[PDB]
């Protein structure tokens, strides 16, 4: 086509989606990770995670307001990944890399799994 | 912070949101523009438009499944802008620029209004 493109549009959209998350506006699901609860937008979760995409395209699960993750999932690892979904920034640290990678594999977040594997390979 | 960032994340999220729109997955509102109907995600509309942000943060309007736009709004102009919201690409043409700018002013999409004003100023 003969379209023009606004370079910052996708980033500005995500920044606004994160502002809605921070103010709990139009969040439509709670993700339960053991004793912790995380409110989010189903569409954003699906856009970032192969697991959430599969869950919310399921004709029965699409209507659930609460999703319980596997008990092996670490709440901090999930929190770091949820922040990444809404900001593009990943708080990857020596103390959390194993939990973050395990959570990203479960959530099916391929690019996160890739950088975790590379950061781990560098420290061995 | 000491975060790392994935450059393409925001673009990949928007591409996935557009895929959900194309398959009518988790769309939660219909925008009526005269005889035409457009299905969309309230969160994406709010993230792109000052008008939709104001509408869906209203304690009563937040719960509506149908929003009727002002009858002066052109359905093609709205369609072009809805595509822009989900892709960052604007199909701006001599034949549609006036309708697109009028629709972007109504929807409160400042960057679109800015490029329309510049493209119009160049042709005078």
């Amino acid at each position: 086509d003969s379209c023009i493109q606004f370079t910052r549009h996708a980033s500005d959209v995500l920044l606004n989606l994160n502002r809605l998350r921070s103010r709990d506006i139009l969040t439509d699901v709670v993700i339960v990770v053991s004793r912790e609860q995380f409110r989010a937008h189903k569409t954003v979760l699906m856009a970032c995670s192969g697991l959430f995409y599969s869950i919310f395209t399921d004709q029965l699960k699409c209507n659930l307001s609460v999703i319980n993750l596997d008990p092996e999932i670490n709440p901090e690892g999930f929190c770091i990944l949820l922040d990444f979904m809404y900001t593009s920034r990943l708080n990857l640290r020596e103390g959390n890399i194993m939990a973050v990678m395990a959570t990203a594999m479960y959530l099916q977040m391929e690019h996160v799994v890739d950088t975790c594997r590379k950061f781990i390979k560098a420290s061995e | 912070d000491s975060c790392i960032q994935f450059t393409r994340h925001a673009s990949d999220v928007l591409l996935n949101l557009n895929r959900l729109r194309s398959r009518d997955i988790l769309t939660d509102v219909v925008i009526v523009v005269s005889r035409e109907q457009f299905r969309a995600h309230k969160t994406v509309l709010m993230a792109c438009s000052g008008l939709f942000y104001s509408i869906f943060t209203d304690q009563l309007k937040c719960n509506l499944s149908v929003i009727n736009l002002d009858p002066e709004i052109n359905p093609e102009g709205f369609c072009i802008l809805l595509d822009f919201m989900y892709t960052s690409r604007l199909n701006l043409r001599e034949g549609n620029i006036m309708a697109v700018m009028a629709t972007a002013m109504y929807l409160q999409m400042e960057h679109v209004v800015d490029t329309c004003r510049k493209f119009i100023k160049a042709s005078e």
Binding site: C3, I4, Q5, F6, T7 | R89, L90, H111, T115
Partner: peptide, 4 residues
């Protein structure tokens, strides 16, 4: 704005 750019030519994509």
């Amino acid at each position: 704005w750019v030519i994509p």
